[PDB]
C-alpha cells in the first residue's frame, strides 16, 4: 500500500559520446566542445583590415613590381595575406638575399612609412630614367621596380658614386638595394662603361662588397641578365654609405618601421570578405564560444585551440536508457 | 555500470522526472507522483561543471603553430620544422581526445555512484521498518503520507516511530 | 581490491571454473558443479576488447622519427634535431607506458566490480528466502534443484513462490 | 540445507602486469603488446631490393669513384643503405657542396636513369683523357671519377669552354660538376696554362662564378690539391650553361629522376639477407602483429609504433590467486 | 565520496584516532576507547607510497632544456628553437599537473573504498550476532568484553561462540 | 548495549590539494613535490669552480681583449658563466665567423692549455709591434687583442708570408686568426703597401682564401676599419699553413683542448658566491630532494625536473573534517 522508489532521470536525447570501453553511448546531456565551421571569408581582425597582396609576393610589394602598384600607399594592417604561389614576384629575374628572414621580420610589423632616402632627381652624373625593361611593363611602357633605381652611364661615363643616408629618426629603417649581373661583357660596357666594377655598402655592422657576375643564362621573362637584391635594418642614428662604379641598383625609397606588434604573413587563396572577426584562419573566420576547433592550425587572433579531431563530445548527463 | 545502480538493480530511468537528475517516485494514500532530490542533484551539477571547466583550463597552454618559410636549399630544416609542428599538434590532439575519453567514463560511473549512495542512505534510514523490493524500491510495513515523505527525502526519518508495526 | 570482491570477501578464485571469468558453484540435492554467468562474462570481453583496441588506435598518431644529416659546422642544428626527436620519443614512450599502467588498474577494478554486482543482482532477488553465509555463498531457507538454478542464473527467480 | 556460491576464475598463469599502486600483479590473462625481436638482416621491402652501398658513400656512388663501379648503373630501389663511415667517399680529397641537402633529396627518389649530357669524346680543343690521379686508382693505375671529366690544356693552350645542355625531358635532371683547387701557381700553368681562371654556371635559377683557390695544404691520399663538387636540379625545359678557362671538372653523366616516392637513407652495418619484409630497421627486419616495438626508432615500411619501453603488458583477465 | 563511506554514512572522522588511518571505537562493560586497524592502514600506506614513487619514476625521462645561440641572420631557427623548447616544457608541465590531479582523485576514492571494505568485513563477520545502527556502528546482541573486541579487529571473531546467546536476545 | 564503531582518521591539517571535480580539498596528509626556492648565488658544481667571465664575452676571452686579461691563465672549470650582454666583446669592431658554433664546442670542453705557436718575435720582415689601436687600450695606451698579431709593412714592403704550424701533440688545437678590412685604398697602402691582397689558410680539411673588403662604415669605438676573425680545430698531427701578402692578423697563441666533458655556457647576471651545490640555475643554486622545481628551465648538475607550475601537491592522506 505505501511505497517509495529511488531512480534517475531519463529522456529523449540522441547525443552520443565515447569512452575507452564503449563507443556511441547515448547520454541524457552532453556538451560539444569542438567548433567545426567557419564563414569562408578573409576579414578585418578586430576593426583593422589585412594587407591583401592579391597576386603580388612580398618582394613584389617592397621593391615595387610595376604590376603591384596597388600597394604604393598602405595603411596600418593587422596581418598580411599572400597567395601560396603569387604570379607577380620579380618582373626582372634574379634573387632576393635572405628573403625568408625578411618575411620573418615582417611578421612582427604592422606599419611602414616610406621615406625617400635618395630621390631619383638627385642623380647629376648618371642617367636615372633609362634603366627600364620590357620584363617590367608599366601601363604599356617598359619600366622597372619603382622603389629602387637602375642607374646607367651618362655621356659614355659612369663616375664613382658615393652616397650616404643617416637615419636621423627614432625608428628602424628597412633599406633595399641591388646589383645587376649582366649577360656579357658587351652589355656591361654598353650600360656602365667600366669593365671592372663593384658595389660597397657599409653600416655600423654591414660590411659588403659585391661584384657583378657576367655569364650566359636561360631567358626568364625574356631576360638573360639577373638582378640580385639585398637589405638591411638601419638603426636609429646609424648611417649607410654606398659606393659604386657600375651595376648599382640604388635605393630611392626605404621603409621606416613605425608600428610593431602581433601580426602574421598568412598563406591563403581567399579574397577580402568585407566583414569583421576576432579570429581568422586561412580558410575563413571563426566565431564561436567553443574551446576547440579543427579548421586550420595557422590562425591569428583570440581563437579556440586547434585539434585534429573530427568529433569531441563531453558527457555531462548520465547514460540514457 | 561500475556501481551496479544505473541499468543494474535499478533497471531503468524515469522519462517522467523533468525535476532533476536523481529522484523519488512515491505511491501512497494521498496520490502518487515524482520528486527529484535537489540536494544531491545540485552537488552533482557542481562536480560536472568544475570537471568541464578544469578540462578546458588544462588545454590553455597547448601548442600554437607559427608559420615559417624556407628556401629550396633549406629542405632539411623545412622538414624538421614541419615534423615538429605536426608533432606537437598530434601530441595535444591525443591529450584532448584521451582526456575526454577518460573523464566521460568517469562521469558516467559518477552518476552511477550518486544514485547508489542515495539508495543506500535511504535504505539504512529504514532498516527493517520497510521491505526492499529489490528493483530499487521500498515498501513500508506501516502507514506513510506526504509529510512522511519530506522526512525521508531530507535525511531524517524516525526509526522507533514505526518500529513496533510488524 | 577497490570494490572488495576479488581477493576480498570471496577469498580466492576457483581453478575449477573454466566457462568464463565469473560464475556460480551450487551444491543441491543432485550433486554439484560450476556455472559461468555467460551474459556478463561476455560484456566483460566486450569491454576489455574495446579497451585494447582503443589504446592501439589512440597510438596510431604517434611521432615517427626521420633521419637527418648535418655537417660539422652545423652542430647547433644537429643537436636541436636530435633533441627534438628524442623529445617526442620520450613523450610517446611516456603516454604509452602510463596509459597501460592506468588502464591495467582500471581493468582489475572492473572485474572486481563485475563480481560484486553478480553477488548483488543475486542477493537482491532471494533476500529472506536465503541466508548470507558470508564467504560469498548462500544457504537456502528452502531446497533447490537443477531447474531452480537456471532461474537464479537467468535473473527471473520468482520470489513470492518460495516464502515458506 | 542447500547452497549456491559466486566466485571467479583462477589459473596456473604466471603472467605479470603493473599498476600505479602495485608492480608484478599476476593476472589470469594478459596481452603482450611490445615486439622485442627482429631477424638481423637487411631485406627487400615488399619485394623491392634496397640499394646497398657497401663501403661506398652516396658521393662516391654519384660521382663514380672508381673503386665504386658496382653501382655504375643501378636498378630501382626501395631504400638506400650506407655505413656509418664508408671507406670510399672522395678518392681525390675535397668537398661536396650542399651534400646533406642532396642526400635529403635522395630520400624521396627511387630510381635514376643516367644520361650522357656532355660526352667525353666531344672535347676537341682540350685533353679529356689525361686527367687522372694516383688518389683514384683503377686496377692499380691512376684513374678518376667516372661521371665527371678532369679537363687539361692541349698544346699549351686552354681555349675558353662554352657548353650548354638543355633538359628536353619531362623529369628533373641532377647535374654534377666541380672545380680543381691546385696547390701552387706552377701546377696551375702546367695543367691549364691561364694563371687567372673561373667557372660560370647558369640555369634559369642558378648564377654561379667559381674561382680556384691556390694554396698549400696537408697531403690527403697523397694530394695537396683539392676538388670541390657542385650540383643543381635542372627542371624540365631549362638549360644549364658552362663557361670556363681552366680548373673545370666537367659533367659527362647526369641523373634523370625517373621514379619519385617514399625512400630513406638508412645507416646500418648489415649486409643483404636475401629475404623479404614489410618493416625494416637498421638492426634487422620485423615480422610482427604487435602494435609497438623497441628495436630502433628509424624504421621504414609498415611498422609498429616505436616506444622506448623494455616491457609493455596489457591486463585482459583478472587478478590471480 | 565515490563509495559513500568517508563523509557519507560515516558522517565524520575521529580526532581521537591518532594511531592510523582507519580503525575502531568500541564500547562495553570494561569501558571504551580507540584503536587503529593495522592491516588496512598498512596495505594503504604501501599503495600510496608506491603511487608517489611511480609518479616520480614516470617523470625522470622528461624533457631537459639546453641553451642554444643564434646570430641575427638566424632569426627563423632561433624562433623554432624557442617554440620547440617551450613546447616540450608545456607538454611535461601538463603531464605533471594532470597526473597529480587525476591521482589525487583516485587516492581520495581509494581511502573511501578502504573504509567501506573495512566496515563490510566486520559486517560479514558479525552477521546477525549484532545490530547495524546505520552510522558505522554495531550494537551487539551478546556480551562483548575487551577480548571479544580485539577479535573482531583482528578479523577472527568466532560467530559460533555467541550464536546461542545472541539468538535469545532477539 | 555493547557497541563497536568503524571510522577513519581526522586531524588539524589545513593542507589542500586539487582534483578534477573539486579544488582546495582539505586533506589529512599531503606531500609537496615542487621546489620553489634557491639561494640566489653562483656556486661550485660538485666542488669544481665555474669560469666566470665577468664583463667579458667568450670572444673577448679567447682573443685576449686587453680589458679582460684576468683570464689570461684559467684553471679547469665545471661550467662557464657569461652575461647576456657583456660590455667587453671586440675592442676593435668587426665579426667572429661561426661564433655560435665555437660557443657550442665549448660546452663540451672543461680545460684549455694556452700555447704559443707563432712567437711575435719571429716576424723579421714585417713590423709586429705596431698593430695597435686606441679602440683596444691597455693601461690607457693603444694596444690590441693579446692572442693574435696585427702585422704591418716594414721598410715600405710587405713580403709574402708563408708560415706553417704542425700540431705535434695528442690534443685537438683551437687556432684563431683574422683579417683587417680597411676603410679606403689609402689606408691599404699605408699599412700593407700591396694594393691587392689575400690570406690563404689550409689544413687537411680547411681550404680558405680571404680577401679584404673596402667599404665606408660608421665609427664603432672610433674605428671605421673592421676586423673579422676565423677559427678551426687542428687535429693531432695535422698542420695549418698560412700565406698572405697583407691584412693578415696572425695567431700568436692557440688553445690546446686538454679536458673534454660535460660543461655548459650559462647566461647569468649573478656573481660568485663562495658555496657548493649539486644543482645550479642562472638565478641561484638549489639544494633539494624534491622531484620537481620551478626556478628556471636551464639548469646544470643533478637537478629536480623543471615544470612551470606555481603549486604541485600530491594527496597521501584522506579528506579531513
Ligand atoms: C647621424 O646623424 C646624427 C645627427 O647629427 C649624428 O648624431 C650625433 O653624433 C655625435 C657624435 O658622432 C653625438 O655626439 C651627437 O649627440 C649626435 N647628435 C644627436 C642629435 O644625436 C650621428 O652620428 C650620425 N650618424 C653617422 C653614422 O654619421
Ligand atoms: C630547351 O628547349 C626547349 C625545347 O626546344 C625550349 O622550349 C621551347 O621553348 C619555346 C620558347 O623558348 C617555347 O615556345 C616552346 O613551346 C618550347 N618547346 C617545347 C616543345 O616545349 C626551352 O625554352 C629550352 N630552354 C632553354 C633554357 O633554352
Ligand atoms: C706533422 O708532424 C708529424 C710528426 O712529425 C708528421 O708525422 C710523421 O709523419 C710521417 C709520414 O709523413 C710518419 O713517418 C711518422 O710516423 C709520423 N709521426 C707521427 C707522430 O704521426 C706529420 O706528417 C706532419 N704533418 C704535416 C701535415 O706535415
Ligand atoms: C558509432 O556510431 C556512428 C554513427 O552514429 C558510426 O559511424 C559507427 O559505426 C558507430 N560505431 C559502432 C561501434 O557501431
Ligand atoms: C617484479 O618482479 C620482477 C621479476 O619477476 C623483479 O625484477 C622486480 O624486482 C619485482 N618488483 C618488485 C617491486 O619487487
Ligand atoms: C583555492 O584556495 C585559494 C586560497 O585561498 C583561493 O584563492 C582560491 O580561490 C580557491 N579556489 C577555489 C575554487 O575556491
CSV table of C-alpha atoms in Angstrom, one decimal, chain F:
chain,number,residue,atom,x,y,z
F,1,UNK,CA,24.1,-2.3,24.6
F,2,UNK,CA,27.7,-3.2,23.6
F,3,UNK,CA,28.9,-1.3,20.5
F,4,UNK,CA,31.8,-1.3,18.1
F,5,UNK,CA,32.2,1.5,15.5
F,6,UNK,CA,34.1,1.7,12.2
F,7,UNK,CA,35.5,5.1,11.3
F,8,UNK,CA,38.5,7.0,10.0
F,9,UNK,CA,41.3,9.4,11.0
F,10,UNK,CA,40.8,13.1,11.2
F,11,UNK,CA,43.2,15.9,12.3
F,12,UNK,CA,44.2,19.6,12.4
F,13,UNK,CA,45.8,19.7,9.0
F,14,UNK,CA,45.0,22.7,6.7
F,15,UNK,CA,46.9,21.4,3.7
F,16,UNK,CA,44.9,21.4,0.4
F,17,UNK,CA,45.1,19.6,-2.9
F,18,UNK,CA,43.1,19.8,-6.1
F,19,UNK,CA,41.1,17.2,-8.1
F,20,UNK,CA,39.3,17.4,-11.5
F,21,UNK,CA,35.9,17.9,-9.8
F,22,UNK,CA,36.9,19.8,-6.8
F,23,UNK,CA,39.6,22.4,-5.8
F,24,UNK,CA,41.0,23.1,-2.4
F,25,UNK,CA,40.0,19.7,-0.8
F,26,UNK,CA,41.4,19.9,2.8
F,27,UNK,CA,43.5,16.7,3.2
F,28,UNK,CA,44.7,14.8,6.2
F,29,UNK,CA,48.2,14.4,4.8
F,30,UNK,CA,49.7,15.9,1.6
F,31,UNK,CA,53.1,16.0,0.1
F,32,UNK,CA,54.6,19.0,-1.7
F,33,UNK,CA,56.8,17.8,-4.5
F,34,UNK,CA,57.7,21.2,-6.0
F,35,UNK,CA,60.9,23.0,-5.1
F,36,UNK,CA,60.2,26.8,-5.2
F,37,UNK,CA,63.3,28.3,-3.6
F,38,UNK,CA,67.0,28.9,-4.5
F,39,UNK,CA,70.0,30.6,-2.8
F,40,UNK,CA,70.4,33.4,-5.3
F,41,UNK,CA,74.1,32.7,-5.9
F,42,UNK,CA,76.5,31.1,-8.4
F,43,UNK,CA,78.2,28.1,-6.7
F,44,UNK,CA,80.9,25.5,-7.3
F,45,UNK,CA,79.5,22.4,-9.0
F,46,UNK,CA,80.5,19.2,-7.2
F,47,UNK,CA,83.4,21.1,-5.8
F,48,UNK,CA,84.7,22.4,-9.1
F,49,UNK,CA,84.5,26.2,-9.6
F,50,UNK,CA,83.0,27.8,-12.7
F,51,UNK,CA,84.9,30.0,-15.1
F,52,UNK,CA,83.0,33.3,-14.5
F,53,UNK,CA,83.6,35.7,-17.4
F,54,UNK,CA,82.5,38.8,-15.6
F,55,UNK,CA,82.1,41.6,-18.1
F,56,UNK,CA,83.8,39.6,-20.9
F,57,UNK,CA,82.4,37.6,-23.8
F,58,UNK,CA,83.9,34.3,-24.9
F,59,UNK,CA,85.4,36.1,-27.9
F,60,UNK,CA,86.9,38.8,-25.6
F,61,UNK,CA,88.5,35.9,-23.6
F,62,UNK,CA,89.8,33.6,-26.4
F,63,UNK,CA,91.1,36.6,-28.5
F,64,UNK,CA,92.5,38.4,-25.5
F,65,UNK,CA,90.8,41.7,-25.4
F,66,UNK,CA,93.1,43.9,-23.2
F,67,UNK,CA,90.3,44.8,-20.9
F,68,UNK,CA,89.9,41.1,-19.9
F,69,UNK,CA,93.4,39.9,-19.1
F,70,UNK,CA,92.0,38.4,-15.9
F,71,UNK,CA,91.6,35.2,-17.9
F,72,UNK,CA,95.0,35.0,-19.5
F,73,UNK,CA,95.6,31.9,-17.2
F,74,UNK,CA,92.5,29.9,-16.3
F,75,UNK,CA,92.2,26.5,-14.5
F,76,UNK,CA,89.8,23.6,-15.3
F,77,UNK,CA,86.2,24.7,-14.8
F,78,UNK,CA,82.8,23.0,-14.4
F,79,UNK,CA,80.7,25.5,-16.4
F,80,UNK,CA,81.1,28.9,-18.0
F,81,UNK,CA,79.1,31.9,-16.9
F,82,UNK,CA,78.6,34.8,-19.3
F,83,UNK,CA,76.4,37.8,-19.1
F,84,UNK,CA,73.6,38.3,-21.5
F,85,UNK,CA,75.3,41.5,-22.9
F,86,UNK,CA,79.0,41.5,-22.0
F,87,UNK,CA,80.3,45.1,-22.0
F,88,UNK,CA,83.5,43.9,-23.5
F,89,UNK,CA,83.4,41.9,-26.7
F,90,UNK,CA,85.5,43.0,-29.6
F,91,UNK,CA,87.5,46.1,-28.7
F,92,UNK,CA,88.3,46.7,-32.3
F,93,UNK,CA,85.0,46.3,-34.1
F,94,UNK,CA,84.1,43.6,-36.7
F,95,UNK,CA,82.9,40.0,-36.6
F,96,UNK,CA,83.7,36.5,-35.4
F,97,UNK,CA,82.9,33.9,-38.1
F,98,UNK,CA,80.8,30.9,-36.9
F,99,UNK,CA,80.9,32.2,-33.3
F,100,UNK,CA,77.9,30.3,-32.0
F,101,UNK,CA,79.3,27.1,-33.5
F,102,UNK,CA,82.5,27.7,-31.5
F,103,UNK,CA,80.5,28.5,-28.3
F,104,UNK,CA,78.7,25.2,-28.9
F,105,UNK,CA,82.0,23.4,-29.0
F,106,UNK,CA,82.9,24.9,-25.6
F,107,UNK,CA,80.0,23.4,-23.8
F,108,UNK,CA,81.8,20.1,-24.2
F,109,UNK,CA,85.2,21.4,-23.0
F,110,UNK,CA,86.5,21.8,-19.4
F,111,UNK,CA,90.1,22.9,-19.8
F,112,UNK,CA,92.3,24.6,-22.3
F,113,UNK,CA,96.1,25.0,-22.3
F,114,UNK,CA,97.2,28.2,-23.9
F,115,UNK,CA,100.4,27.5,-26.1
F,116,UNK,CA,102.5,29.8,-28.2
F,117,UNK,CA,102.6,28.6,-31.8
F,118,UNK,CA,103.9,31.6,-33.7
F,119,UNK,CA,106.1,33.8,-31.5
F,120,UNK,CA,105.6,37.5,-32.0
F,121,UNK,CA,109.5,37.7,-32.1
F,122,UNK,CA,109.7,35.6,-35.3
F,123,UNK,CA,108.4,38.2,-37.7
F,124,UNK,CA,111.6,39.5,-39.2
F,125,UNK,CA,110.4,41.1,-42.4
F,126,UNK,CA,107.3,42.7,-41.0
F,127,UNK,CA,106.5,45.1,-38.2
F,128,UNK,CA,105.0,43.0,-35.4
F,129,UNK,CA,104.7,45.6,-32.6
F,130,UNK,CA,102.8,48.4,-34.3
F,131,UNK,CA,99.4,46.9,-35.0
F,132,UNK,CA,97.8,48.8,-32.1
F,133,UNK,CA,94.6,50.9,-31.7
F,134,UNK,CA,93.1,53.3,-29.2
F,135,UNK,CA,90.0,51.1,-29.6
F,136,UNK,CA,91.9,48.5,-27.5
F,137,UNK,CA,93.5,50.4,-24.7
F,138,UNK,CA,95.9,48.6,-22.2
F,139,UNK,CA,96.9,50.8,-19.3
F,140,UNK,CA,95.4,53.8,-21.1
F,141,UNK,CA,97.6,53.2,-24.2
F,142,UNK,CA,96.8,51.9,-27.7
F,143,UNK,CA,97.0,48.1,-27.7
F,144,UNK,CA,95.3,45.1,-29.4
F,145,UNK,CA,94.0,41.6,-28.9
F,146,UNK,CA,96.7,39.6,-26.9
F,147,UNK,CA,96.5,36.3,-28.7
F,148,UNK,CA,96.9,37.5,-32.3
F,149,UNK,CA,99.2,39.9,-34.0
F,150,UNK,CA,98.3,42.7,-36.4
F,151,UNK,CA,101.3,42.7,-38.8
F,152,UNK,CA,102.2,45.8,-40.6
F,153,UNK,CA,104.6,46.6,-43.5
F,154,UNK,CA,108.3,47.2,-42.8
F,155,UNK,CA,110.7,49.4,-44.7
F,156,UNK,CA,107.9,50.1,-47.2
F,157,UNK,CA,107.4,46.5,-48.1
F,158,UNK,CA,105.2,43.6,-47.1
F,159,UNK,CA,106.9,40.4,-48.4
F,160,UNK,CA,104.5,37.4,-48.9
F,161,UNK,CA,104.2,35.5,-45.7
F,162,UNK,CA,104.4,31.7,-45.6
F,163,UNK,CA,104.3,30.2,-42.1
F,164,UNK,CA,103.1,26.8,-41.1
F,165,UNK,CA,102.4,25.2,-37.8
F,166,UNK,CA,102.2,21.5,-37.1
F,167,UNK,CA,100.2,20.1,-34.1
F,168,UNK,CA,102.6,17.5,-32.7
F,169,UNK,CA,100.6,16.9,-29.6
F,170,UNK,CA,97.9,14.3,-28.7
F,171,UNK,CA,95.2,17.0,-28.4
F,172,UNK,CA,93.0,19.0,-30.7
F,173,UNK,CA,94.2,22.6,-31.0
F,174,UNK,CA,91.8,25.6,-31.4
F,175,UNK,CA,93.6,28.1,-33.7
F,176,UNK,CA,92.4,31.7,-34.3
F,177,UNK,CA,93.4,34.4,-36.8
F,178,UNK,CA,91.8,37.3,-38.6
F,179,UNK,CA,91.7,39.7,-41.5
F,180,UNK,CA,91.6,43.5,-41.4
F,181,UNK,CA,89.1,45.3,-43.7
F,182,UNK,CA,90.5,48.9,-44.0
F,183,UNK,CA,88.3,51.9,-44.8
F,184,UNK,CA,89.9,53.1,-48.1
F,185,UNK,CA,92.7,52.3,-50.6
F,186,UNK,CA,95.0,54.9,-49.0
F,187,UNK,CA,94.9,53.1,-45.6
F,188,UNK,CA,95.6,49.8,-47.5
F,189,UNK,CA,98.8,51.3,-48.8
F,190,UNK,CA,99.9,52.9,-45.6
F,191,UNK,CA,99.6,49.7,-43.7
F,192,UNK,CA,100.4,46.9,-46.1
F,193,UNK,CA,101.9,48.5,-49.2
F,194,UNK,CA,100.4,46.0,-51.6
F,195,UNK,CA,97.1,47.2,-53.0
F,196,UNK,CA,95.6,43.7,-53.8
F,197,UNK,CA,95.9,41.1,-51.0
F,198,UNK,CA,94.7,37.8,-49.7
F,199,UNK,CA,95.0,35.3,-46.9
F,200,UNK,CA,95.0,31.6,-47.7
F,201,UNK,CA,94.6,29.1,-44.9
F,202,UNK,CA,94.9,25.4,-45.4
F,203,UNK,CA,94.6,22.4,-43.1
F,204,UNK,CA,93.9,18.9,-44.3
F,205,UNK,CA,90.2,19.9,-44.2
F,206,UNK,CA,90.2,23.7,-44.4
F,207,UNK,CA,90.7,25.4,-47.8
F,208,UNK,CA,90.2,29.1,-47.2
F,209,UNK,CA,91.1,32.3,-49.2
F,210,UNK,CA,90.2,35.6,-47.6
F,211,UNK,CA,90.1,38.9,-49.4
F,212,UNK,CA,89.8,42.2,-47.6
F,213,UNK,CA,86.7,44.3,-48.5
F,214,UNK,CA,86.9,48.1,-48.6
F,215,UNK,CA,83.8,50.0,-47.6
F,216,UNK,CA,82.8,53.2,-45.9
F,217,UNK,CA,81.4,52.4,-42.4
F,218,UNK,CA,80.3,54.2,-39.3
F,219,UNK,CA,82.7,54.6,-36.5
F,220,UNK,CA,82.4,52.0,-33.7
F,221,UNK,CA,84.8,52.6,-30.8
F,222,UNK,CA,86.2,55.3,-33.0
F,223,UNK,CA,87.0,52.8,-35.8
F,224,UNK,CA,85.7,52.6,-39.4
F,225,UNK,CA,88.0,49.6,-40.0
F,226,UNK,CA,86.7,46.2,-39.2
F,227,UNK,CA,88.4,43.0,-38.1
F,228,UNK,CA,87.0,39.6,-38.9
F,229,UNK,CA,88.1,36.5,-37.0
F,230,UNK,CA,88.2,32.9,-38.1
F,231,UNK,CA,89.0,29.6,-36.3
F,232,UNK,CA,89.5,25.9,-36.8
F,233,UNK,CA,90.2,22.8,-34.8
F,234,UNK,CA,93.6,21.4,-35.7
F,235,UNK,CA,93.7,17.7,-35.3
F,236,UNK,CA,96.7,15.8,-33.9
F,237,UNK,CA,99.4,15.6,-36.5
F,238,UNK,CA,97.7,17.9,-39.0
F,239,UNK,CA,99.4,21.1,-40.0
F,240,UNK,CA,97.9,24.6,-40.6
F,241,UNK,CA,99.5,26.6,-43.4
F,242,UNK,CA,99.1,30.4,-43.8
F,243,UNK,CA,100.0,32.6,-46.8
F,244,UNK,CA,99.4,36.3,-47.0
F,245,UNK,CA,100.6,39.4,-48.7
F,246,UNK,CA,98.7,41.8,-46.5
F,247,UNK,CA,95.9,42.4,-44.0
F,248,UNK,CA,96.8,39.3,-42.0
F,249,UNK,CA,96.1,39.1,-38.3
F,250,UNK,CA,98.3,36.2,-37.3
F,251,UNK,CA,97.9,33.7,-34.5
F,252,UNK,CA,100.4,34.1,-31.6
F,253,UNK,CA,98.7,31.8,-29.0
F,254,UNK,CA,96.3,28.9,-29.6
F,255,UNK,CA,94.4,26.7,-27.3
F,256,UNK,CA,95.1,23.1,-26.7
F,257,UNK,CA,92.0,21.1,-25.6
F,258,UNK,CA,93.1,19.2,-22.5
F,259,UNK,CA,89.9,18.1,-20.9
F,260,UNK,CA,86.6,17.2,-22.6
F,261,UNK,CA,83.4,16.5,-20.6
F,262,UNK,CA,80.0,17.8,-19.6
F,263,UNK,CA,80.1,21.6,-19.4
F,264,UNK,CA,77.8,24.5,-20.4
F,265,UNK,CA,77.7,28.2,-21.2
F,266,UNK,CA,75.2,29.6,-18.7
F,267,UNK,CA,73.8,33.0,-19.1
F,268,UNK,CA,73.6,34.7,-15.7
F,269,UNK,CA,73.9,38.2,-14.2
F,270,UNK,CA,75.0,36.8,-10.9
F,271,UNK,CA,78.4,36.8,-9.3
F,272,UNK,CA,80.4,34.0,-7.5
F,273,UNK,CA,79.1,33.2,-4.0
F,274,UNK,CA,81.7,31.0,-2.4
F,275,UNK,CA,79.5,28.0,-1.9
F,276,UNK,CA,79.0,24.5,-3.3
F,277,UNK,CA,75.9,22.7,-4.9
F,278,UNK,CA,74.9,19.7,-7.0
F,279,UNK,CA,72.4,21.8,-9.0
F,280,UNK,CA,72.9,25.3,-10.4
F,281,UNK,CA,70.4,27.6,-12.2
F,282,UNK,CA,71.0,31.0,-13.8
F,283,UNK,CA,69.1,32.6,-10.8
F,284,UNK,CA,70.7,30.6,-8.0
F,285,UNK,CA,71.6,27.2,-6.7
F,286,UNK,CA,69.2,24.6,-5.4
F,287,UNK,CA,69.6,22.2,-2.5
F,288,UNK,CA,66.6,19.9,-2.7
F,289,UNK,CA,65.2,16.4,-2.5
F,290,UNK,CA,62.1,17.5,-4.3
F,291,UNK,CA,61.4,15.6,-7.6
F,292,UNK,CA,60.3,19.0,-9.2
F,293,UNK,CA,61.3,22.6,-9.2
F,294,UNK,CA,60.1,25.7,-11.0
F,295,UNK,CA,63.0,28.1,-10.6
F,296,UNK,CA,64.3,28.1,-14.2
F,297,UNK,CA,64.5,25.7,-17.1
F,298,UNK,CA,68.2,25.9,-18.0
F,299,UNK,CA,69.9,24.0,-15.1
F,300,UNK,CA,73.2,22.1,-14.8
F,301,UNK,CA,74.1,19.2,-12.5
F,302,UNK,CA,71.8,16.7,-10.8
F,303,UNK,CA,68.6,18.6,-10.6
F,304,UNK,CA,64.9,18.1,-10.0
F,305,UNK,CA,62.8,18.2,-13.1
F,306,UNK,CA,61.5,21.7,-14.2
F,307,UNK,CA,57.8,22.4,-14.5
F,308,UNK,CA,56.0,25.8,-14.9
F,309,UNK,CA,53.6,25.3,-12.1
F,310,UNK,CA,53.3,27.6,-9.1
F,311,UNK,CA,51.9,24.6,-7.0
F,312,UNK,CA,52.2,20.9,-7.1
F,313,UNK,CA,50.8,18.9,-4.2
F,314,UNK,CA,50.1,15.2,-4.0
F,315,UNK,CA,47.4,13.8,-1.7
F,316,UNK,CA,48.5,11.0,0.6
F,317,UNK,CA,46.0,11.0,3.4
F,318,UNK,CA,42.2,11.3,3.2
F,319,UNK,CA,39.6,14.1,3.2
F,320,UNK,CA,39.8,15.9,6.5
F,321,UNK,CA,37.0,17.3,8.7
